[PDB]
Amino acid sequence: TSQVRQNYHQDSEAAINRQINLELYASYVYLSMSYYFDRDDVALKNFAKYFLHQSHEEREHAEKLMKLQNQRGGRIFLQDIKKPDCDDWESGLNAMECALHLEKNVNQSLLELHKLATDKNDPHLCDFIETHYLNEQVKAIKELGDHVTNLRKMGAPESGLAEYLFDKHTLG
Amino acid sequence: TSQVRQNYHQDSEAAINRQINLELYASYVYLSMSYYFDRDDVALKNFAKYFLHQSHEEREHAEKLMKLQNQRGGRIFLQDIKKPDCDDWESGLNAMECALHLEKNVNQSLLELHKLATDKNDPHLCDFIETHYLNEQVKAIKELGDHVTNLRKMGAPESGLAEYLFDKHTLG
Amino acid sequence: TSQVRQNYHQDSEAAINRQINLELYASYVYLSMSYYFDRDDVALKNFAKYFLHQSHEEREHAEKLMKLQNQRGGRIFLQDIKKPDCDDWESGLNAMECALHLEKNVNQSLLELHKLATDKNDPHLCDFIETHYLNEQVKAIKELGDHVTNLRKMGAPESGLAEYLFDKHTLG
Amino acid sequence: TSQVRQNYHQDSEAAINRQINLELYASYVYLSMSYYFDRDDVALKNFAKYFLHQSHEEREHAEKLMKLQNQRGGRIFLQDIKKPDCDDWESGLNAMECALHLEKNVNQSLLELHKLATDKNDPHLCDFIETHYLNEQVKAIKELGDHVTNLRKMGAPESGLAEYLFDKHTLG
Amino acid sequence: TSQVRQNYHQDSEAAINRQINLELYASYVYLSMSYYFDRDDVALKNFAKYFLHQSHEEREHAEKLMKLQNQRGGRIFLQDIKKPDCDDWESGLNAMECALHLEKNVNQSLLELHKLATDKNDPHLCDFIETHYLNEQVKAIKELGDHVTNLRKMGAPESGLAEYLFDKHTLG
Amino acid sequence: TSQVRQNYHQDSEAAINRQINLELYASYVYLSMSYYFDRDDVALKNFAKYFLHQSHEEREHAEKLMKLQNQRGGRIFLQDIKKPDCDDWESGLNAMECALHLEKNVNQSLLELHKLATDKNDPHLCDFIETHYLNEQVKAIKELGDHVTNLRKMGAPESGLAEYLFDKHTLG
Ligand code: NA
Ligand code: NA
Ligand code: NA
Ligand code: NA
Ligand code: NA
Ligand code: NA
Ligand code: NA
Ligand code: NA
Ligand code: NA
Ligand code: NA
Ligand code: NA
Ligand code: NA
Ligand code: NA
Ligand code: NA
Ligand code: NA
Ligand code: NA
Ligand code: NA
Ligand code: NA
Ligand code: NA
Ligand code: NA
Ligand code: NA
Ligand code: NA
Ligand code: NA
Ligand code: NA
Ligand code: NA
Ligand code: NA
Ligand code: NA
Ligand code: NA
Ligand SMILES: [Zn+2]
Ligand SMILES: [Zn+2]
Ligand SMILES: [Zn+2]
Ligand SMILES: [Zn+2]
Ligand SMILES: [Zn+2]
Ligand SMILES: [Zn+2]
Ligand SMILES: [Zn+2]
Ligand SMILES: [Zn+2]
Ligand SMILES: [Zn+2]
Ligand SMILES: [Zn+2]
Ligand SMILES: [Zn+2]
Ligand SMILES: [Zn+2]
Ligand SMILES: [Zn+2]
Ligand SMILES: [Zn+2]
Ligand SMILES: [Zn+2]
Ligand SMILES: [Zn+2]
Ligand SMILES: [Zn+2]
Ligand SMILES: [Zn+2]
Ligand SMILES: [Zn+2]
Ligand SMILES: [Zn+2]
Ligand SMILES: [Zn+2]
Ligand SMILES: [Zn+2]
Ligand SMILES: [Zn+2]
Ligand SMILES: [Zn+2]
Ligand SMILES: [Zn+2]
Ligand SMILES: [Zn+2]
Ligand SMILES: [Zn+2]
Ligand SMILES: [Zn+2]
Ligand SMILES: [Zn+2]
Ligand SMILES: [Zn+2]
Ligand SMILES: [Zn+2]
Ligand SMILES: [Zn+2]
Ligand SMILES: [Zn+2]
Ligand SMILES: [Zn+2]
Ligand SMILES: [Zn+2]
Ligand SMILES: [Zn+2]
Ligand SMILES: [Zn+2]
Ligand SMILES: [Zn+2]
Ligand SMILES: [Zn+2]
Ligand SMILES: [Zn+2]
Ligand SMILES: [Zn+2]
Ligand SMILES: [Zn+2]
Ligand SMILES: [Zn+2]
Ligand SMILES: [Zn+2]
Ligand SMILES: [Zn+2]
Ligand SMILES: [Zn+2]
Ligand SMILES: [Zn+2]
Ligand SMILES: [Zn+2]
Ligand SMILES: [Zn+2]
Ligand SMILES: [Zn+2]
Ligand SMILES: [Zn+2]
Ligand SMILES: [Zn+2]
Ligand SMILES: [Zn+2]
Ligand SMILES: [Zn+2]
Ligand SMILES: [Zn+2]
Ligand SMILES: [Zn+2]
Ligand SMILES: [Zn+2]
Ligand SMILES: [Zn+2]
Ligand SMILES: [Zn+2]
Ligand SMILES: [Zn+2]
Ligand SMILES: [Zn+2]
Ligand SMILES: [Zn+2]
Ligand SMILES: [Zn+2]
Ligand SMILES: [Zn+2]
Ligand SMILES: [Zn+2]
Ligand SMILES: [Zn+2]
Ligand SMILES: [Zn+2]
Ligand SMILES: [Zn+2]
């Protein structure tokens, strides 16, 4: 047992390791999306920039969870980072919809983590999740939903002009 | 169902709409108080300034709740903003006591909202309430209680000199 | 009778109270419109910003009328602020058309107020209306008419691209 | 009953008074440690500085709890501040281990306080504890654990060179 | 015996430990007074500020005595810090009178300490007391006497207006 | 075939995808090492900082290879990022030796990549490897070899003082 460990349940430690893997996976998904839009036959530089920024953000989320794991005296156990579901993300609208799906999945995982911390009476972990992850997820989901709405209303994916102008005016 | 909606109960959405109305109502009450003290036969400019500032603050609280409602994918339903209970607020001390009563009512509504969010296992909403409303209410109630105490100790409302000097030295 | 009251007819005082309510109502309508465009399934941030600014402006108009009421020695009597006619404003073009209708209604009320002040030989009130409200209404109506014209010419509401680009280039 | 008191249980008020005493006690313990390292036969100035800073920090924690007690309308009841368990803290490593023990005791008290506030449905008090005390305790415990680990690995307390160099390089 | 000890009598060392406790006690008394005036039913913020400043000053006095004890090679022995005589200080005037009584008690203790240092032919300790404590006590006593005189002359404690205006104009 | 593809062999494209995976793997290894040294029972903050910096650098190397793949008209195919070989890196010296082994492995992969590009007569790819990767690997290997030499000469891993002072003076 770690000399710093106090009120930190083994179930919570395991769930934090699972969340670390999920954040690293999300980072990898966004990296794949970013370099899809960097292809010469897609060529939407601001979509590429948007998703690269998200990928770096998800890496930061993972590192904050690793820092928490050490702060509480749990032990980090890393796992394989699985490859993303797609190599070809088909369009800006499809990538935004996949990102929305992924962010809602990550949010569900975080809500389950909060439920576990509540059940184990770990208010520090509950506060950590609420303070650093829950509103970040709500904001990310709202932003992605807005992007999806605008792309659809503009005529994406059938209108390449729609994605070009969205790339310029919203993501630029 | 909104594409962004996740873990947002219909009861919580309804209670947020009720709180929006309550904040707009509080804004209206403070506006009435402010312009009562702007009357030529009352003529306490810093009481008027104090309550105008509170009115603008309550409008901001309402707008933050509307923003939350959209962030979570709920739908804003506005209602009539009822007129304040008084047209004549009788004195600075009476207006401060009415404001204290109103802030404790709003606080009770927020505590009921927090209880509902806890019962529906919505930690994001609980965190939103705690972070942006609960300590604001506690601070507002403590400030109003202090003002009431000082006005009473100075001899208000029978001493017009008391309210004049309080207007100058505490609210100025 | 107020010690400051001079040449201020009771009919004028009543009409000023009615105008105060109308300005607060207009503020509420614009607030509703603003947060309609903040929805994730509408997602036009600059429409939302435009109407929020108008809502704050209408609150300022109401407060200037309350200040006038006290300056002249009349007494403010507040009434319920009725809810806006719509919860769903359907599109940027429809909201702009409703705003144009509302501003022309407010202008008609102000012209009736000016007629009353003229009939009661209250040149200070006539000057107040002309100086602070009449050209503001004419400018607001012309601006809204311009917005409606451009949205229609661009193909709104059927073209979501039209409202997206109007949001970006005119309202942004 | 205080005019500001709302949703503040007498048990919570009593537990806050107990925590105030515990924070003042911790401040006294750290003060004793600091001036132990200021002795001419110990002479570790940066250990002395470290513990003096902690003592002032614990005084600040106590004052924030007193401020909370008044904000909620509870009444502060002070008790004797008991003397620290030791006059002679024997070594830098022993003092760091005693500080780690003390911080884990204070953390346990704060977790019991949070459990009580949760049981009494006082979300403002829960938020106060989480926001201002729980992560502070986790960070303090992790820091002390790190210091203990490094001192042990360097050969303290048998190596006076170890504590000298730790004083210079980590605490300086 | 400490390697630095020279011309430092054991009686002087004991009396310095007693003075350390007395200064810490005075700090605690002032802390209690400060947060009495922070209550919502007392609400005199500048009285609260005044006594908080005095409390921090008394902590500094205690720390300077601890530093002296180590400089001379004596050993600090801490004792319990007894709780203050009152929880409720009843009024600004009563608190100022209690503070005057406390400062005269501390001054008497310091004069006895000086007499002891003179009797033991310890000129360094005599100089320390004269330089850092005696005129500080005389100035504090004169200031408190002035405050008491002004509060009484203004009509305190029966006049709440008196304490309000003293809080504003003398302590603000 | 990509419209930009010229003199880019399918074997080279495959080897670039393999190198992308190897760089991401190296980033993950360094991340694991970094947070090993962040544990409370290891507590070497500058080792942790060193390896975190290396992890971010390896992510940058991977992204530059992905950028190259798109510049040449090849297609990125991502694979699973395998977990690092160790969860516990045992000591600063052992982690530095593992890092040296890993960097020499990555260097061997890059030399094989250069041999392939030479065999396929792809001077742009050869230049890319030489310019951005080969001297970076040589410098990294020399730096790690220096660190290993110094840690061994200082007495690591048996001397915890050795790793403490190396952490302070070389990595700090
Ligand atoms: Na996954
Ligand atoms: Na999903
Ligand atoms: Na989805
Ligand atoms: Na879900
Ligand atoms: Na109401
Ligand atoms: Na009058
Ligand atoms: Na109430
Ligand atoms: Na009340
Ligand atoms: Na209540
Ligand atoms: Na109306
Ligand atoms: Na939708
Ligand atoms: Na109209
Ligand atoms: Na119209
Ligand atoms: Na008309
Ligand atoms: Na204790
Ligand atoms: Na010695
Ligand atoms: Na403990
Ligand atoms: Na311990
Ligand atoms: Na415990
Ligand atoms: Na005493
Ligand atoms: Na005395
Ligand atoms: Na006295
Ligand atoms: Na005496
Ligand atoms: Na590998
Ligand atoms: Na350990
Ligand atoms: Na190797
Ligand atoms: Na090697
Ligand atoms: Na080799
Ligand atoms: Zn351990
Ligand atoms: Zn994330
Ligand atoms: Zn971060
Ligand atoms: Zn740890
Ligand atoms: Zn473990
Ligand atoms: Zn593992
Ligand atoms: Zn995927
Ligand atoms: Zn494609
Ligand atoms: Zn906890
Ligand atoms: Zn936390
Ligand atoms: Zn919807
Ligand atoms: Zn409010
Ligand atoms: Zn706000
Ligand atoms: Zn929405
Ligand atoms: Zn709904
Ligand atoms: Zn409605
Ligand atoms: Zn009312
Ligand atoms: Zn009146
Ligand atoms: Zn939630
Ligand atoms: Zn939240
Ligand atoms: Zn009047
Ligand atoms: Zn938004
Ligand atoms: Zn208007
Ligand atoms: Zn104005
Ligand atoms: Zn008036
Ligand atoms: Zn009237
Ligand atoms: Zn009315
Ligand atoms: Zn309407
Ligand atoms: Zn609609
Ligand atoms: Zn006139
Ligand atoms: Zn005029
Ligand atoms: Zn124009
Ligand atoms: Zn355009
Ligand atoms: Zn009370
Ligand atoms: Zn503390
Ligand atoms: Zn503080
Ligand atoms: Zn109080
Ligand atoms: Zn009480
Ligand atoms: Zn007591
Ligand atoms: Zn102790
Ligand atoms: Zn010792
Ligand atoms: Zn509460
Ligand atoms: Zn909570
Ligand atoms: Zn709180
Ligand atoms: Zn000694
Ligand atoms: Zn206060
Ligand atoms: Zn003193
Ligand atoms: Zn000092
Ligand atoms: Zn000494
Ligand atoms: Zn001694
Ligand atoms: Zn003792
Ligand atoms: Zn006392
Ligand atoms: Zn009292
Ligand atoms: Zn001497
Ligand atoms: Zn001296
Ligand atoms: Zn004087
Ligand atoms: Zn292609
Ligand atoms: Zn590399
Ligand atoms: Zn790069
Ligand atoms: Zn390409
Ligand atoms: Zn290909
Ligand atoms: Zn693949
Ligand atoms: Zn490995
Ligand atoms: Zn290990
Ligand atoms: Zn080439
Ligand atoms: Zn060459
Ligand atoms: Zn090249
Ligand atoms: Zn050294």
Kindly tell me the sign of the dihedral angle through the C-alpha atoms of F16, F17, F18, F19: positive
d(CA E102, CA E140): 11
The experimental resolution of this structure, in angstroms, equals 1.4
The backbone torsions φ and ψ at residue E145, rounded to the nearest 5 degrees and listed phi first, read -60, -40
Chain C closest-CA separation from residue A141 CA (Å): 10
Expressed in angstroms and rounded, the spacing between residue E104 Cα and the centre of ligand 23 is 7
d(CA C58, CA C51): 10
Asked if C102 contacts B69 with a C-beta cutoff of 8 angstroms, the reply is: no
* Closest CA relative to residue B166, chosen from B103, B99, B95, B65: B95
C81: three-class secondary structure by DSSP: strand
Asked if A107 contacts A52 with a C-beta cutoff of 8 angstroms, the reply is: no
Chain D closest-CA separation from residue E119 CA (Å): 26
CATH topology of domain A10-170: Ferritin (1.20.1260)
Chain A closest-CA separation from residue B144 CA (Å): 30
The amino acid that residue B157 corresponds to is P
Asked if B7 contacts B71 with a C-beta cutoff of 8 angstroms, the reply is: no
d(CA D18, CA E46): 27
d(CA D164, CA B128): 48
Chain A closest-CA separation from residue F85 CA (Å): 10
- Where do the structural domains in chain E lie, given as residue ranges? 10-170
Beta bridge partners of A81: F81
DSSP for C104-124, written as a single string: HHHHHHHHHHHHHHHHTT-HH
The amino acid that residue E59 corresponds to is R
Tell me whether residue C10 is exposed, middle or buried, using C-beta atoms within 10 angstroms of its C-beta: 0 to 12, 13 to 18, 19 or more: exposed
Q: How was this structure determined?
A: cryo-EM
Tokens of F37: 């040294």
Q: How many CA atoms lie within 13 A of F129 on its CB side?
A: 22
E157: cis peptide before it, omega within 30°? yes
Chain breaks in chain F (C to N over 2.5 A) after: none
Alpha helix stretches (DSSP H) within C74-159: 92-119, 123-129, 135-154
Asked if E129 contacts E117 with a C-beta cutoff of 8 angstroms, the reply is: yes
C35: three-class secondary structure by DSSP: helix
What subunits make at least 3 CB pairs under 8 angstroms with A?
Answer: B, C, D, F
Alpha helix stretches (DSSP H) within chain A: 10-37, 45-71, 92-119, 123-129, 135-154, 160-169
Asked if F66 contacts F76 with a C-beta cutoff of 8 angstroms, the reply is: yes
Q: CB under 8 Å to B31, separation ≥6 — which residues?
A: B51, B52, B55, C63, C66, C78
Cβ-Cβ contacts under 8 Å, B4 against chain A? 100, 141-142, 145
- What is the CA angle E73-E79-E81, rounded to 5? 130
Alpha helix stretches (DSSP H) within chain F: 10-37, 45-71, 92-119, 123-129, 135-154, 160-169
Kindly tell me the sign of the dihedral angle through the C-alpha atoms of D25, D31, D34, D38: negative
Q: What share of chain D is helix, strand, coil (3-state, %, to 5)?
A: 75, 0, 25
Q: Does D164 touch chain E (CB under 8 A)?
A: no
d(CA F53, CA F49): 6
CB count, 10 Å around CB of C41?
Answer: 16
Asked if B87 contacts C75 with a C-beta cutoff of 8 angstroms, the reply is: yes
The amino acid that residue E105 corresponds to is N
Using CB atoms, which residue from D3, D6, D123 is nearest to B130? D123
Asked if F11 contacts F119 with a C-beta cutoff of 8 angstroms, the reply is: no
d(CA C81, CA E124): 79
Tell me whether residue D29 is exposed, middle or buried, using C-beta atoms within 10 angstroms of its C-beta: 0 to 12, 13 to 18, 19 or more: buried
Q: For the CA atoms of chain F, what is the radius of gyration?
A: 18
d(CA D137, CA D101): 12
Beta bridge partners of D81: E81
Q: CB under 8 Å to D57, separation ≥6 — which residues?
A: none
d(CA A24, CA C112): 66
Please give the DSSP secondary-structure letter assigned to residue D82.
P
What count of CB pairs under 8 Å joins B to E?
35
Asked if A12 contacts A120 with a C-beta cutoff of 8 angstroms, the reply is: yes
Cα dihedral A97, A98, A100, A104 in deg (nearest 10): 140
d(CA E15, CA E76): 11
d(CA C135, CA C107): 10
Cα dihedral A107, A109, A110, A115 in deg (nearest 10): 130
Please give the DSSP secondary-structure letter assigned to residue F82.
P
Asked if D64 contacts D82 with a C-beta cutoff of 8 angstroms, the reply is: no
d(CA A147, CA A28): 21
d(CA C31, CA C53): 9
d(CA E77, CA B73): 64
Tokens of B13: 């959405």
Mutation pick from D93, D163, D169, D171 vs chain F, by most beta carbons of F within 10 Å, is D169
Using CB atoms, which residue from B2, B40, B84 is nearest to C70? B40
The amino acid that residue C133 corresponds to is Y
Cβ-Cβ contacts under 8 Å, D2 against chain B? 145
Do B and C count as touching (3 or more CB pairs closer than 8 A)? yes
Expressed in angstroms and rounded, the spacing between residue B22 Cα and the centre of ligand 46 is 26
Q: Which residue has the tokens 């909370």?
A: D68
d(CA F24, CA F62): 6
The backbone torsions φ and ψ at residue F2, rounded to the nearest 5 degrees and listed phi first, read -65, 145
d(CA F79, CA B85): 68
Asked if A101 contacts A156 with a C-beta cutoff of 8 angstroms, the reply is: no
The angle that helices F92-119 and F45-71 make with each other, rounded to 10 degrees, is 10
Q: Which residue has the tokens 């305190």?
A: E156
The amino acid that residue E169 corresponds to is H
Q: Does A150 touch chain B (CB under 8 A)?
A: no
Inter-chain CB proximity C40 and A150 less than 8 Å: no
Phi-psi region of B155 (alpha: psi -120 to 50; beta: other; left: phi over 0): left
Q: For the CA atoms of chain A, what is the radius of gyration?
A: 18
d(CA E36, CA D43): 40
Kindly tell me the sign of the dihedral angle through the C-alpha atoms of D104, D105, D110, D114: positive
Inter-chain CB proximity D35 and E70 less than 8 Å: yes
Q: Which residue has the tokens 């790339």?
A: A167
The angle that helices E160-169 and B135-154 make with each other, rounded to 10 degrees, is 120
Q: Which DSSP helix (H) or strand (E) runs through C43?
A: none
The backbone torsions φ and ψ at residue D75, rounded to the nearest 5 degrees and listed phi first, read -120, 130
Ligand nearest to C-alpha C40: 42
Tokens of F14: 């495959």
